[PDB]
Design a protein around this ligand. Sequence first.
Ligand SMILES: C/C=C(\C)CC/C=C(\C)CCC=C(C)C
Lengths: 970, 48
Amino acid sequence: SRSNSGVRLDGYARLVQQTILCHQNPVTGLLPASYDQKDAWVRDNVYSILAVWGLGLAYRKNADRDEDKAKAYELEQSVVKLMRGLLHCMIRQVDKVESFKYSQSTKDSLHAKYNTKTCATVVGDDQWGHLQLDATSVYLLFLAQMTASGLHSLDEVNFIQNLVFYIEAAYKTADFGIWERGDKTNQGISELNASSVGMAKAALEALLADEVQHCQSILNSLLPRASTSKEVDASLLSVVSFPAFAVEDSQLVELTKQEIITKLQGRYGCCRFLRDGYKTPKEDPNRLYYEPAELKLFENIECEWPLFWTYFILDGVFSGNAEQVQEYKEALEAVLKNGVPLLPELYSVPPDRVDEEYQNPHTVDRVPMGKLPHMWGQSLYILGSLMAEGFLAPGEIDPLNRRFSTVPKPDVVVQVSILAETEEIKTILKDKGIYVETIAEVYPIRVQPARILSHIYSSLGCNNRMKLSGRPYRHMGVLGTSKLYDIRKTIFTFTPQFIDQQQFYLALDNKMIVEMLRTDLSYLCSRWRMTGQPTITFPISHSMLDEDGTSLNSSILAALRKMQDGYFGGARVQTGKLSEFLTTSCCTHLSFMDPGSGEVDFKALVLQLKEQADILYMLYTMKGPDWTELYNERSATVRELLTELYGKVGEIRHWGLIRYISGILRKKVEALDEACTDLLSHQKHLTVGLPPEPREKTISAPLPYEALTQLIDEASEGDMSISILTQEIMVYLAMYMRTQPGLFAEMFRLRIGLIIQVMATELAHSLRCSAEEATEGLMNLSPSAMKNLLHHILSGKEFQGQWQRRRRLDGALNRVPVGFYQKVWKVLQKCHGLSVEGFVLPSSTTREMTPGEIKFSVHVESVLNRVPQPEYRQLLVEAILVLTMLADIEIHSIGSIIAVEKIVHIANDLFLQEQKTLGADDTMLAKDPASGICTLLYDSAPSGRFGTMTYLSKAAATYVQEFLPHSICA
Amino acid sequence: TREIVIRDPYALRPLRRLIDAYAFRIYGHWVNRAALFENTPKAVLLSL
Ligand SMILES: C/C=C(\C)CC/C=C(\C)CCC=C(C)C
């Protein structure tokens, strides 16, 4: 090997020694960022040791002589030393890991910088924005990979598992990002970056799959966009490619790479993100933050980082390629010291040449500044060279086969065991043909609720010596409660979450349980990427039987018979005894569980209750609010009979009553924070009340269950029977996004109050009735019937007045056209802003929002979609797009903030005159008591000579006539 | 020219094609595709 491969290996040894290993501290093993930046970043240290690890691996695959063994051992032990030093850096902050485990706050996060001479902390928590889930996640990922490569106390194992819990909730934790500045605006605003989420997913996979697939949901929803305030980040290459490989969608990976190439790639590398301005000649060097008005200034002149082209060589090596264009384009290396490449950190447009670069993008000869060499980039450069020259293989750097993520994974067959709670239930199930086994017969396998599984993991990770307290109580979804568990040598199987949660009306409806089971199976068939085959334990309880008790629910039978047939829930299902499923299951072993009016005196007014059960309940709110857990003077309290009333109406299944009792007793869904976190996990915002704006409190970020529940209560303003609707509809939307997320495309802000109003309207026109009696029959809907209404609301299925209904359906669902937000970005260039109901969407937003941001989307949907009425909004949507339509033909720009409502109205006044003349009944046109827009205008089709969009075209042209006196149109 | 958009946006062809395309982008999820088209004033419509 020394003939022609040992000399080149020694050349790379000199490269790594003179670029990386020269700066490693003999005391700590950490690497200072540069001469000026003497501190050691976690992520930079982890990335900078990749070259050393790869060299050691190279040296070892050819280590036969001693000297070669000495070099390989030195390199491998340098890598081990660096990782151990970073460990004591994190170990010294065990009080921060423990605090972030429960309260994921930026003030309780691990520091990014550490003293390279003492493994201590250099700055204060307040001083750097230390929350960077990607640094800890990349450390965990490469700790898993290096160990799987043969690189070697239990206390640090407990600390590492507590770090697993630390980065476990990264799909819902705002971050300061890989660039440790949060959002682009650069005001220290913690933001959810897909880079951190993907790195956390990779670290967890290499090292509980529920939060792993939550991170997967974040990745699918966010890509190709980076985060809320970023169209694209070149750091996404660290997720869709080396080192995370956290995206298993090949199309998504290709789309993200193409977005990076098209938007950020330049002559001297790739810009980190659009309007970055980290080392641009336009920033203020001594000012830490960025004013929202200078972000425009950074456009088209952002610094291009050669570091990202090392990622483009790494993929290309990991995935075989002729991307030998990414190499050969890195001739932009500083010294050819002696001849050391010295990959720069970034290239900045020379200051004088700002105007030329702005105008002519990616064309000016930039200068190198920042760190030189960028050790994070230099290590990746050396690793890619090693890998590309045949001295290394993807399987040596990646012994965990993270690269095989993109390969299509086959559908999984979910084995289900239907277990009888009681033997009588088993007898009924058999009369009907499903042969099952009782929970007693399944012994020695012990069936437990998922609550017990969540509590068991709270004893994982605990060392009281360093004050680490297990894992926080997290709800285990279907993914967690589908593996079999080896606890104290006896196998424990756990039923899904939705079965033991019988505290809200959803569990009483057997159809709901069928629907929850179907959603769980659909989620399992797609998200199970685990060794073994998942096993859903489905016990048929006594509540699952019919009214008589000698027969089983039809819906539950039908579901079980379909599962026996192999298909239910979009999933192939194998039913059988739980004993048969031991050999082909994810039988994980939990080793931590081994031991070792008048008359205001309310003296006698409840006497009227002593049989309609509606009236009995009605009195009971007078006697609750006026008199909830107070006495009744008959060995009874207000709460007690309300619970008795709740049980009675559950037995009679008159759903309006159950909902009301639930509503005034403040029944709350336990897995509701999970529903909100799932809906927000898919990059969909939520608003909770009736539509006028203050009541409708928006949910932009995840909220803890107490807050979420409290936000729901205050959004009803005391008006009952909607606070429960918000939770129930949120749950249904979560299930439908888990199962049929295509239904939720072109939707970005779910207005629950508008949804409820549109369900009431649909119950009013279907089963024609008054809108009000329909608002009351919506109460009397079964939970599964209401879920069906929501399906039909979403998919627009029907059980001269049509176009008003559509305009309503789409507006309530807040459905926007494809490309609508980017089109709004275009008009804001022309006009000075849009005004809806007096609220202004200024053009200054575009000076800090790139068109494809999901932060500009929110800005638009907060000025436009806030309109209470469902249709008025869909018309305001048209008037914007006809404004977008006519902006292209118009050659000039106007200095007015255009009031879209007026264009809607001017079209309204243009609707009376034209229709009256074409000759239509004056009473045929009817104004709206809420919007002042003729009902027939809503009923009008979009296109045509009398189409509503044509009227707005005749309105916008007659609107901008006084603003634009002259209009040399194209 | 503006006057044409004000008077008869539809006849002028280039604009109509745009109007009809915008109708679909927004509302082709509801799709003869004619439902998205209204060439009768509701009176000649509600005549039968
Ligand atoms: C050529 C004139 C029209 C086609 C009338 C409709 C256009 C406008 C009223 C102005 C559009 C320009 C913006 C910046 C919104």
